[PDB]
Amino acid sequence: FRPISVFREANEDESGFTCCAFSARERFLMLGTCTGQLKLYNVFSGQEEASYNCHNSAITHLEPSRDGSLLLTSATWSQPLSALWGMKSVFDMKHSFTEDHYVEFSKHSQDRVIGTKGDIAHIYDIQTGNKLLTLFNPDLANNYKRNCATFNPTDDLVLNDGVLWDVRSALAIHKFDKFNMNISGVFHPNGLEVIINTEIWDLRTFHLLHTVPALDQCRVVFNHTGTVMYGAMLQAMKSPFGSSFRTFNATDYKPIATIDVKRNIFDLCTDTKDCYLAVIENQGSMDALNMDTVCRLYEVG
Ligand SMILES: CC(C)(Cc1ccccc1)c1cc2ccccc2c2nccn12
Ligand SMILES: CC(C)(Cc1ccccc1)c1cc2ccccc2c2nccn12
């Protein structure tokens, strides 16, 4: 991991970056802020290119669509909590998702949104904004504190609160046992495995494939080719993560690197060519009057 660039928020006594994702335009990173702005930066010069006030509370998550035309955001206490934005010509709001505190696109065909409200997942149509499905079974809930509902790479399975759902049937297929308080899991991009905290489960057999202790309390991100997995660990404006991230081979789950950047991490993401890792790092503690985050770009890569 060679450092390539660093920048702080412009136009600001203190720097309030909270989350990031590369745009569909190469060289440009999208970042959310603690005042609910979405900004576009040149990742090498550190130049702010554009700004929009998406929310009147801190941005906690964003996801751009692959084709460049849409963006999801989630805020902190604002109503609506999550929204979908169009970014063709004029930046505008298309839909909002009133009490969903987290939202993702579908993966194969990005025509749906999946939102999380506590233990409950909601699936929405992008065009109409309509709620198509609610996935929730009170007998199967794990009540994970950092529940994030997510589609599998083919958009036909959902993981919500440690429960595997079939989207077409709207039926729970399997409940994975609860082995931690917080992390609910993701799908591996191979379509065959799920990573729930320290457990890797096979989707065809439900056997345990691997135990990876170093994934405890880690938010997992994959690079775009699906060969490397990045883990940032939840903290014991408070940072969501501690100051180290871990990388693993995505095919055999063997450790590649432990990087302690010595600053609490707010977010990390890779570009679509997997040359770079962008990391939001806090120069301040949570005791500071104000936030002072930087975006650091590392070549992996
Ligand atoms: C859609 C567009 C006009 C594109 C554009 C405009 C100027 C420079 C580069 C790209 C635009 C995009 C955007 C993306 C993220 C955060 C804010 C904005 C934003 N705020 C008002 C304008 N925009
Ligand atoms: C809760 C989460 C979505 C991170 C997460 C944790 C566990 C499981 C999945 C996802 C998140 C929270 C937050 C709160 C304050 C400021 C920035 C952020 C922020 N920036 C990128 C993500 N976040």
From Swiss-Prot:
A motif (DWD box 2) lies at residues 199-206. Ubiquitously expressed. A motif (DWD box 1) lies at residues 163-170. The modification Phosphoserine is found at S239. It is found in: Cytoplasm; Nucleus; Cytoplasm, Cytoskeleton, Microtubule organizing center, Centrosome. WD repeats lie at residues 12-51, 54-95, 97-134, 136-168, 169-211. Residues 12-211 are annotated as: WD repeat-like region. Induction: Up-regulated in a number of cancer cell lines (at protein level). Signal peptide: none annotated. Belongs to the VPRBP/DCAF1 family. The protein kinase-like region mediates the threonine-protein kinase activity. The DWD boxes are required for interaction with DDB1. Acts both as a substrate recognition component of E3 ubiquitin-protein ligase complexes and as an atypical serine/threonine-protein kinase, playing key roles in various processes such as cell cycle, telomerase regulation and histone modification. Probable substrate-specific adapter of a DCX (DDB1-CUL4-X-box) E3 ubiquitin-protein ligase complex, named CUL4A-RBX1-DDB1-DCAF1/VPRBP complex, which mediates ubiquitination and proteasome-dependent degradation of proteins such as NF2. (Microbial infection) In case of infection by HIV-1 virus, it is recruited by HIV-1 Vpr in order to hijack the CUL4A-RBX1-DDB1-DCAF1/VPRBP function leading to arrest the cell cycle in G2 phase, and also to protect the viral protein from proteasomal degradation by another E3 ubiquitin ligase. The HIV-1 Vpr protein hijacks the CUL4A-RBX1-DDB1-DCAF1/VPRBP complex to promote ubiquitination and degradation of proteins such as TERT and ZIP/ZGPAT. Component of the DCX (DDB1-CUL4-X-box) E3 ubiquitin-protein ligase complex, named CUL4A-RBX1-DDB1-DCAF1/VPRBP complex. Interacts with DDB1; the interaction is direct. Also forms a ternary complex with DDA1 and DDB1. Interacts with NF2 (via FERM domain). Component of the EDVP complex, a E3 ligase complex containing DYRK2, EDD/UBR5, DDB1 and DCAF1. Interacts with DYRK2; the interaction is direct. Interacts with RAG1; the interaction is direct. Interacts with LLGL1 and LLGL2. Interacts with histone H3. This is DDB1- and CUL4-associated factor 1. It comes from Homo sapiens.
